[PDB]
Amino acid sequence: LEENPAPDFTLNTLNGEVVKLSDLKGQVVIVNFWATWCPPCREEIPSMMRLNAAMAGKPFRMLCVSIDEGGKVAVEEFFRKTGFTLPVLLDADKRVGKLYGTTGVPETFVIDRHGVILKKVVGAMEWDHPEVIAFLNNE
Instruction: For residue 114, give every residue at least 6 positions away whose Cβ sits within 8 Å of its Cβ, in sequence order, or none.
Output: 5, 25
CA distance 115 to 82: 33
What is the CATH number that goes with domain 1-139? 3.40.30.10
Respond yes or no on whether the N-terminal peptide bond of residue 59 is cis (omega within 30° of 0): no
Judge whether 86 and 48 are in contact, CB under 8 Å. yes
CB burial of 90-126 (b: ≥16 within 10 Å; e: otherwise) equals bbeeeebbeebebeebbbbbbbbeebebeebeeebbe
CA distance 111 to 117: 4
Determine how many CB atoms are found less than 10 A away from the CB of residue 16: 7
Query: What is the phi/psi pair of residue 79, to 5°?
Result: -70, -35
CA distance 129 to 84: 20
β-partners of residue 65 are: 33, 89
Q: To 10 degrees, what angle do helices 130-137 and 39-54 make?
A: 50
Handedness of CA 105, 111, 9, 89 (dihedral sign): positive
Q: What is the resolution of this structure in A?
A: 2.5
Q: Which of 54, 25, 53 is nearest to 112 (CA)?
A: 25
CA distance 127 to 106: 13
CA distance 125 to 114: 25
